[PDB]
Each structure stands twice: as C-alpha cells, then as structure tokens.
Amino acid sequence: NAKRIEGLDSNVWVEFTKLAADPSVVNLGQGFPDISPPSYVKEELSKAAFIDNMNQYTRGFGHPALVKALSCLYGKIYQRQIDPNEEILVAVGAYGSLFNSIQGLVDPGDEVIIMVPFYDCYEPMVRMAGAVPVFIPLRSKPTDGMKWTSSDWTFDPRELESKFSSKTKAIILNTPHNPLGKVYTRQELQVIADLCVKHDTLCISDEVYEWLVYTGHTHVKIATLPGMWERTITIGSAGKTFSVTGWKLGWSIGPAHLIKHLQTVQQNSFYTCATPLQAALAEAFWIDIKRMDDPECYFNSLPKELEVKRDRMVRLLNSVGLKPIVPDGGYFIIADVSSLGADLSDMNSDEPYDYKFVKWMTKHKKLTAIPVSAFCDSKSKPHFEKLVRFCFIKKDSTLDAAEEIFRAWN
Amino acid sequence: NAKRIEGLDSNVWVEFTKLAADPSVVNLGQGFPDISPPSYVKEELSKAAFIDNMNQYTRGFGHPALVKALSCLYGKIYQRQIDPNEEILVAVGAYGSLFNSIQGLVDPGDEVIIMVPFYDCYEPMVRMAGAVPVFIPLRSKPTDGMKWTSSDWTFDPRELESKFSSKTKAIILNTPHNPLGKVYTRQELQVIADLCVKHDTLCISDEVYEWLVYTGHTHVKIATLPGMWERTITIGSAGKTFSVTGWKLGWSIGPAHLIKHLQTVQQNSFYTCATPLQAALAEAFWIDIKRMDDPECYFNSLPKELEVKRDRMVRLLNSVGLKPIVPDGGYFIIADVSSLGADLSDMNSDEPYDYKFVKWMTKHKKLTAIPVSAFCDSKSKPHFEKLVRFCFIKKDSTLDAAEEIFRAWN
Ligand SMILES: Cc1ncc(COP(=O)(O)O)c(CN)c1O
Ligand SMILES: *Cc1c(COP(=O)(O)O)cnc(C)c1O
Ligand SMILES: [Ca+2]
Ligand SMILES: [Ca+2]
Ligand SMILES: [Ca+2]
Ligand SMILES: [Ca+2]
C-alpha cells in the first residue's frame, strides 16, 4: 500500500455493514432515505435514458445544462452572478467535491481545522493529503429550560482563535451539521470569517443540507459574508437536494482561482460524471427553480415534511427515557442514552459506550442507530460516547415500525 | 494551488475546445460514439429509475448485482473463481480505476514504465503521485509488403529490460491499444510478465477495448500468464462494453491484497458510484452473459459490426493518399499524413506537425481528427508527429458524411 494511505483503511461505514444485515431490524442508522424521490426526478432519468446523446460523454467539469441550472439557482441565493464554467465543478457527490478541494488546495504539513463531531470523512481526507488535522470540540451551553436543541451547542471563539497559526491552510465548516443538526448562526459564521481573513486562510463549507432547516432557523452561507467569496469553497449534493442519494452528484461553488485548482484534480482523476444523471438533474432543478416561491417547490415541501417527522422522533425517544437533542436542521437526531444504565458491561471489548449501546439495541430491541463517537478523533471520544444518532428521512410505515419497538420497550 | 498538481493543469482534451465548435464539420476526433446503445441497455436504466431503492445508496465498492455479474463473466474468462467483494472494485469509469490503482499503490520516487504513444492520462496520474514516468517507444518493423497494420508495431525486449530497475514499481499496459489499435501478442505479454516477476513489480492493465478485437487476433490478459494474477490489476469499462461512454463506470479486477488498497483510495475519495446506473448495467450484462456462444451477444455483434466500418475507413483513407495503419482492435485508426501536399507555413509556430495538419484539415476540409503527438512525451513527438488518429465507432450517416469529404478532397 502507498504511504499516502497508511492507516486510512478502516472506515466507520465498512465496520457498520454487519449491523443492518438481519431482515427484521428497523434501520434508523444510515442516511438512507426510504421516502420516494420526487416523481419528476425519476421520470427525467427515464426520459434521459432513451436519448442516445445523454448516454455518451458530456463536459468534464459538468453537463452544460446542469451547470447552467446551478448557476441560475445559486445566483439567486448569493445575490450575485455565478459563472457556470469557471465558478462551478460537478463531481461524484459531495465526497468527491470535498476530495477535489483538499487534493487541489492542501499541501503536506499544512494544518486544517476540524470541528468535532465531524463528518467522518474529513479526517482521513486531510491526512492523505499529508496535512495535519487540528481538532476543536463543540461544547454545550445551558438549555432554555424546556427543550434540548442543536442551538444549545456552540464553539468557544477564544479556543477557536488559538487553533489558527501561520500553519493553518484551511477550516472545514459543516452547516447544517452532521451529526448534531446545528444550523450555525450569522455571529458564529462571523467569528470563523474574521479568523480566515486575519490569517489569510481558506474555508471549505459542507452545505449539502442547506434546504433542510426548520422554523426559527435560517441557512446563512459563510461565503456570502464580507471578505469570504475570494476564500471559500461551498459544497452541495444532489442526494440531499433531491432525496436521490444513489445518484452521487455534487458541486463545489467558489471563486475562479480556487475552482481551477479543483478542476485540475478532477481532470486527472475520473474526469467526467455520468451524463444521464446530470441531464436528468438539470431538468429537476428547472422544475423547482421556476417555482421557488410556492409551497410545491421541493426546496420547501421537503423540510416541511421532515419537521413533522422530526417532532415524532423527539417524542418517541423521550417516551423511552432517551434524552434527544432536537436538531435545527438536517435529518439526524442525536439522543443521550446514559439515563438507561443499560444491561451491557459485558460486551467485553474496548469499544466506546455508544458502539456497545447500539450493538445491544440491535440484538435486544431490533433497532439500529449510529454511535456519535464514529464522528470524533481519539481524544474526543470519551466526551461524546454516551450519544447516539438516529435518521428520520423515513416514510410513515418505517417510523410506525420504530414506534411499535419503543412502545414495547418496557 | 497544491504542489502535487503543479503544472498538471494543462489537459490535452480541454485544449480540443479548438475548432470542435463549427457545426458544419464531421467530427472523427473524440471517442464519442453516435451509434445507438443496445436498446436493452437504455430500457434497464429506465426500469431502474422507477425503483425507489435503486435511487439511493448502494454497496460502496460496487452494487452487489453488478459485482456478482462481473464475477461471473470474468471468472469464465480467467478460468478461475473471482471473489465479487474482495477482488473487484467498481469505480467512476476506467479513468477512476486507473487513479485508484496509482494513488493506492505508488509512492513518491517510484518509477512507472509507460509505452509511447500512451493514453494521455497515464503521465499526469503517475506524476500526481510523485512518481517518475519512464518512457519506452513502440517501433515499426518491416511490413509484409502488402498493407500497414498495428501488428507491425512492437517493442525491443532488451530496451524494455533496461527500463526495469529497483525503482520500478509498475508498468502500465494498454491492450487493445489507444491510439494504434495494437492487440498485444502472447509473446509480447510474456516479455512484460517475465520482467515483472524477475523485478517484483506490478502490472496495471488497461483492457477497456477487450471485446474490440478483429479477425485473426485474440485478446489475452496478462493477469492469466503464470505468476501474474498476484501482481496485476486489470481494468474494464461500461462505456466501451456497452457503447455508453456517458455512464462512467469501470472496474479493477485483481488479487485481494491489491484490491484492498484501491478500496482504501475509493472510500477516501468518492466512495460510492451511481446506483441506477450500476443496477441497469448488471442487467445488461446478464442478458449478454446468457448468450455468449451466439452472434446476437453484444460482445460478438459489436466487433463484427465495427470491423466493416474499420475497412470502410481504410479504403477512404487510401483513396485520398493517407497511409492507414490498419488496427487489430478498438475503434481508432492512425493514418500517416506525410505524403500529401499540405501547404503549412500559414501557421508558422512550431507546435507539432500533426496539430498543424488537424487545424488545416478542419478549416479547409471540415473534418477533425486527433494529432498522435498528443499521446507522446516531449522527447518522443518528433517520431510520431506525422500521425493522425481517426475514430470510427460512428453510424452509417456519419461515414457517409465522411465519404462526401474524401470523394471531394481532390
Ligand atoms: C485506453 C483508455 N483507457 C481509459 C479510458 C477512460 O475511459 P472511462 O470513460 O471508462 O473512464 C479511455 C477513453 N476512451 C481509453 O481510451
Ligand atoms: C451524506 C454526507 C456527505 C456525502 O455526500 P454525497 O454527495 O452522497 O457524496 C457529505 N457531507 C455530509 C456532511 C453528509 O452528511
Ligand atoms: Ca501497511
Ligand atoms: Ca460573473
Ligand atoms: Ca496565514
Ligand atoms: Ca523490485
């Protein structure tokens, strides 16, 4: 094995295969939606399949129709013109987008700042590039009293400051957050912005869940703050936008001098993404772009649907004594489990508490979830191992099945 | 810009956004087929599109149905049992597979041996991993007197031996060959095998055009030669097998201790490939695997269909005094361009002769093709700069259009 991938071979998701196996569990682990994608999205792929051309090579950096659509939509959001050719790169999901960014902008020996918990792929990506991850935890503040929420989690600005040195190449932002469901405030993005301009550093911003924010919160794009356009790469994904996760298409939006470096990586790695998926997606985007103001638009209906399902989950977890953190956005809910004193002690390995809890819950209660320590570097695990994450982008029937398990819990 | 991509930003194909533009001209440039894909390939995408789960995440290293099918087809070919999970890896095209091999197996300072002309991505891939490309040209032998063919090209064994040293990590082989259409012989493959065993080095075998073998030649896989299985990665593609270049799906077949390393690269880069695409591809395979002995099998029908078109091209090229090199395989044909008139000081730079010619033939004759010098290291271009590459995976209509211009050359 090449030196660049020394000890990058284990992967949380690989390890989680033998969990979801057994047919009769209700899987609330993986971010596998089992609702239907919008009908028009399925239809458009079918339509694309029967056109010859759309089954051949398209433009390497993205299908013209797609990049046209994206530049239209994000033009609206940034309130500025987005160049479809120079300021956008279409890649294999947000994974690929992340990988482009890091591969093309981050050198060996550079520091990259990561907030914990993080989407687990951040650490190995930065490591393979020969770069050093510098970790900083999110910490809880006190509750309003009545509710525990994603918004009761923040970072210490003075702590954050001290993580930037002349060795900081970049910071990785994830709002809405996986796994907390935190929707970063303007003030919080202002602190991060301030520092990248003070230290002349990049900001990579994972914003795949941009559409999934719930009432009382607003997705704010760091890249839109003063001084940030020139220094930010902002990521987005078709799986998350169209509930079509198996399409594996994402985009990186940012300034032409940073985006060029990502395109250099792409052309030297896989080059093109599939034509029919891009063709189909372009059309979906036009369908929903042309109706952004209406409740019908998928960018509106989907959070509306999920906010309901979220609230069902707060209750189901509360019902069994699990203490949930109600998320401002996204489709994951983190629950604290330490208040059940569970009948483990005797999976005997040196796993964190939460991997154990989930194993127990699968064998005994017929339900899977993801341990939050899967999203933490070593030093961080003990400070997060009583937390367990559940996914709610599920259809009614599934959440029913979940409800049956919780009601039968004692 | 990160050091690892330094001066890798020039891409040959980005540059052929030259006079590709003019709508009037017949493009025999890029390997963009305008034949229809086999109608069942299109149906299965459509069918897959309407299944909800086929639009969500699948197994990261390859859709289970697709690896099962690859396992079955290739185990017939290899005369061995191939593990679908441990010995295959589905990647975003052959491009993706190549990148997975280099990144996963090659360190800074290794030497990788490449044969010239080479498919152009081989050079910067090896460069991006900080390895040093080591070039060896293909050379002409005296012809049989009658015609010029790909089999009249080959390499000096003693010259090859001399490129092997203790710094050699791998050799890249591409049969059938792009751009000359050379089908490597058992004797030639035996030389490469010998040196790989003797020096303990990897072979990466770009076999995308494997079904495109013409009359009186046979695809043989180096991986089946004694001692090769355990040191060979053999690459395939959907775009070539099913004339569906826009699907961007390929695979690496090899031993587990090597495949595991490609998997590490994948999971830390794009992870999962498109589900609807992979589901449909598997189906397409089963259709054809079940009828191999039959002339309807796309495997048998496509090369048969294409051979006619190859000969058509040879005639057309002869008929205007371009000396065709008749290809044993794949869908590209090189013509020696040098005994024409062709004015050429109307340009006056000293970018290579074949680029000048292609610009000339585009403007003056409304026909594009690819200069062979594009596929050569700088030291090598003088020796291939009077060579031009034409693609013939085209529909009758297009070879009619081409024949109009060849009839109208003089
Ligand atoms: C020899 C060779 N290898 C690899 C590729 C890349 O193909 P894919 O689109 O499957 O990545 C091509 C493109 N025709 C090729 O000619
Ligand atoms: C699921 C997820 C991804 C992966 O995105 P794809 O577009 O499916 O490649 C990336 N980032 C975050 C924060 C995620 O939750
Ligand atoms: Ca090792
Ligand atoms: Ca502009
Ligand atoms: Ca600095
Ligand atoms: Ca050796």
Side-chain angles (χ1 to χ4, degrees), chain A residues 4 11 36 46 52 56 243, chain B residues 36 46 52 56 103 106 245 271:
Chain A
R4 77 176 60 76
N11 188 275
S36 282
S46 172
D52 281 357
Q56 303 321 310
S243 297
Chain B
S36 277
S46 201
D52 277 348
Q56 311 298 331
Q103 289 286 304
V106 185
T245 49
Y271 221 155

Side-chain angles (χ1 to χ4, degrees), chain A residues 56-255:
Chain A
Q56 303 321 310
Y57 285 132
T58 195
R59 184 181 164 271
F61 300 153
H63 194 65
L66 180 53
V67 289
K68 199 217 283 250
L70 295 165
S71 87
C72 171
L73 179 70
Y74 288 87
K76 271 136 134 97
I77 292 157
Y78 286 67
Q79 283 172 68
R80 72 108 72 30
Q81 196 202 45
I82 304 270
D83 203 299
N85 302 302
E86 306 303 288
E87 292 171 331
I88 311 166
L89 177 62
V90 178
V92 188
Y95 252 87
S97 299
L98 283 152
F99 183 83
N100 289 336
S101 317
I102 287 151
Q103 275 299 300
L105 305 161
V106 177
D107 271 315
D110 278 334
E111 284 160 7
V112 173
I113 294 164
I114 305 173
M115 289 171 286
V116 28
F118 48 86
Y119 191 69
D120 66 297
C121 94
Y122 305 168
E123 145 166 18
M125 281 181 179
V126 340
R127 305 194 104 107
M128 189 177 164
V132 0
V134 162
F135 301 110
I136 177 170
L138 297 188
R139 302 172 180 284
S140 340
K141 63 208 183 96
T143 284
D144 65 43
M146 285 141 194
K147 235 32 73 88
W148 198 12
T149 76
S150 280
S151 273
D152 291 312
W153 283 85
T154 192
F155 58 84
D156 183 356
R158 301 169 72 250
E159 183 176 17
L160 179 65
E161 172 149 36
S162 75
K163 298 286 147 67
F164 284 78
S165 61
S166 80
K167 292 230 195 181
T168 315
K169 180 41 69 46
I171 185 163
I172 303 174
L173 164 63
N174 185 203
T175 183
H177 194 267
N178 181 9
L180 268 162
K182 173 175 171 68
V183 171
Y184 282 69
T185 63
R186 186 169 304 263
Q187 296 90 346
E188 275 168 358
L189 312 170
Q190 191 57 80
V191 164
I192 302 169
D194 279 357
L195 289 169
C196 303
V197 36
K198 210 189 94 205
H199 293 265
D200 189 23
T201 88
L202 278 33
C203 176
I204 301 175
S205 183
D206 196 337
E207 301 180 8
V208 304
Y209 301 118
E210 53 197 303
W211 301 107
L212 313 169
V213 324
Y214 307 118
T215 54
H217 305 101
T218 286
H219 188 89
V220 161
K221 284 195 173 267
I222 203 177
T224 62
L225 268 49
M228 298 294 289
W229 169 266
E230 14 143 26
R231 61 178 16 92
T232 308
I233 292 291
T234 305
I235 292 155
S237 162
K240 282 79 135 112
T241 306
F242 288 97
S243 297
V244 89
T245 67
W247 286 29
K248 286 297 292 211
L249 286 171
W251 39 92
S252 310
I253 288 185

Side-chain angles (χ1 to χ4, degrees), chain A residues 295-312:
Chain A
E296 323 308 300
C297 176
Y298 199 61
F299 315 151
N300 308 327
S301 25
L302 186 60
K304 200 189 89 250
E305 234 159 277
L306 299 175
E307 197 168 331
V308 174
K309 282 176 206 287
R310 180 193 64 180
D311 291 357
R312 190 166 180 190

